[PDB]
Design goal:
The protein has two domains: 1-32, Single Sheet (Ubiquitin Ligase Nedd4, Chain: W); 38-147, Chitinase A, domain 3 (Roll). It is 23% helix and 25% strand. It has three helices and seven strands. It binds imidazo[1,2-a]pyridin-6-ylmethanol (3 copies). One of its GO terms (cellular component) is ciliary basal body.
Length: 147
């Protein structure tokens, strides 16, 4: 029935069914639709004090907690989903990855190159789809599959 990683769940505040993906952490009301050697993705990274390197082009010393980083990620996802801001604009302004300068674009990659939670989420996304918060040793990511 449902494509890889997708499950049905129950809204606590409304009672309506929704869909959640335990590989990408995406969630949506709509029933999802449904592997290539390579995918292309953009991402927005928010680092935290336990990141493998807690420093970035934005801040010499990253001191925010992982919980604070998750709140920031959740807020960016809200703004992207409402259309108030674009993914590319938020990545350019706020991603702690040097790829911020390229609107978050990482280029194309195969399995075996990225950190595993990032790789698994990227390959479970369909072209055009966006992840929820994805956790790695670098921090917390929002991933957009572009090809
Ligand atoms: O896959 C269909 C789909 C997924 C996500 C979504 N968000 C708003 C409308 N949406 C439709
Ligand atoms: O962080 C790795 C990476 C990937 C792509 C890229 N484009 C501009 C800077 N960039 C950095
Ligand atoms: O190989 C990873 C990497 C690092 C730095 C960088 N700058 C532009 C593209 N880039 C890719």
């Amino acid at each position: 029935k449902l494509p890889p990683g997708w499950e049905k769940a129950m809204s606590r505040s409304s009672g309506r069914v929704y869909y959640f993906n335990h590989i990408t952490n995406a969630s949506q009301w709509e029933r999802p639709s449904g592997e290539p050697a390579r995918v292309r993705c953009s991402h927005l990274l928010v680092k935290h004090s336990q990141s493998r390197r807690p420093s970035s082009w934005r801040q010499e010393k990253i001191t925010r907690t992982k919980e604070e980083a998750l709140e920031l990620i959740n807020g960016y996802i809200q703004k992207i989903k409402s259309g108030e801001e674009d993914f590319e604009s938020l990545a350019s302004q706020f991603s702690d990855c040097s790829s911020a300068k390229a609107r978050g674009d990482l280029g194309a990659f195969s399995r075996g190159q990225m950190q595993k939670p990032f790789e698994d989420a990227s390959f479970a996304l369909r072209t055009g789809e966006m992840s929820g918060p994805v956790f790695t040793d670098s921090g917390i990511h929002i991933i957009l599959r572009t090809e």
